[PDB]
Amino acid sequence: MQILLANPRGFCAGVDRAISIVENALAIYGAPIYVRHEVVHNRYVVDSLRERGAIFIEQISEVPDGAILIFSAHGVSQAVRNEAKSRDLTVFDATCPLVTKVHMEVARASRRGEESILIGHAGHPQVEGTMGQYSNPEGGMYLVESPDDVWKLTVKNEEKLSFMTQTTLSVDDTSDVIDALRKRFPKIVGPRKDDICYATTNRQEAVRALAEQAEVVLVVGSKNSSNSNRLAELAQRMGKRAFLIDDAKDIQEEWVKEVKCVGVTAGASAPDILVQNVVARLQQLGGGEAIPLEGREENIVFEVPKELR
Ligand SMILES: C/C(=C\COP(=O)(O)OP(=O)(O)O)CO
Numbered sequence: 001m002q003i004l005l006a007n008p009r010g011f012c013a014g015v016d017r018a019i020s021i022v023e024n025a026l027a028i029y030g031a032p033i034y035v036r037h038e039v040v041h042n043r044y045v046v047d048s049l050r051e052r053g054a055i056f057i058e059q060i061s062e063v064p065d066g067a068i069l070i071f072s073a074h075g076v077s078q079a080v081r082n083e084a085k086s087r088d089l090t091v092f093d094a095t096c097p098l099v100t101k102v103h104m105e106v107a108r109a110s111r112r113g114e115e116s117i118l119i120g121h122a123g124h125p126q127v128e129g130t131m132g133q134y135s136n137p138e139g140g141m142y143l144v145e146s147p148d149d150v151w152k153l154t155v156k157n158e159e160k161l162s163f164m165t166q167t168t169l170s171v172d173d174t175s176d177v178i179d180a181l182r183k184r185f186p187k188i189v190g191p192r193k194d195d196i197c198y199a200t201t202n203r204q205e206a207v208r209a210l211a212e213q214a215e216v217v218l219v220v221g222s223k224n225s226s227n228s229n230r231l232a233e234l235a236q237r238m239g240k241r242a243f244l245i246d247d248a249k250d251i252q253e254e255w256v257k258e259v260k261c262v263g264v265t266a267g268a269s270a271p272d273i274l275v276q277n278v279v280a281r282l283q284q285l286g287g288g289e290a291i292p293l294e295g296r297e298e299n300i301v302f303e304v305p306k307e308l309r
């Protein structure tokens, strides 16, 4: 069985920085370090950091006075940031810069009292943080997930309206939502295409190329990783069996029985060690040397804050 690897796959710049912020805080200050939400949506990265003394909580009221608190890469609402500020924690912010960029646009629209629409998935933490940049009661902040939600939405002033997106969406699905927004609200303003990040766009482009060669696609990533779920979904819509897996133990041999070409990719929050162990399992099940596909170059790095070097 041929094993193919998508390119690019695995860690993005945001994730690499976020994990280093927690590791470097643990190195500089010792355990414990509190982290609001899973730093990135990857069980191995989270369990790893847990075993090292990071404590993952969901609410600032779970964090003791005097503690060091790190906001996760997904970002936080103003109400969360203000809560932490009023508690006098020591706070470091691991929010990906490309999520902060969207936050600054929502804040700008709130200040202007002009309505904004976010395209994203309800209950995802990045959505909760981005919607939570909008504070002005005179305006409005609305979430839509599909064209159906656009066809139900009414706003106060459609002549002064903007949109933004979550970073880790399907590029194709998000384009359909934007088409519906522009048809319903022709004066809406937004970025040229969407706020989907480079890493999400590139991994989807790479899984499309992978799925055109492979019969079955394995995506290394956790169940609550949006970007990882988009990669498995993209391959399934091409007609390929595709499975989201945390690690090699999740591989069912029936999935690759008499398969001549299996493709492996990984979401932006999945470490390469997991991919290596998945490739070693697939070789136990009859696979050959893993062949990486040619792919679009990534060259972005985001450094940790100076105070955490
Ligand atoms: C931090 C982040 C992306 C990195 O991968 P994650 O898997 O942590 O997050 P997501 O795909 O959005 O569920 C932006 O939400």
Ligand code: F3S
Binding pocket: 012, 013, 014, 015, 073, 096, 097, 098, 099, 167, 168, 197, 198, 199, 200, 227, 268
């Ligand atoms: S928003 Fe940031 S954390 Fe990664 S998946 Fe995109 S570069």
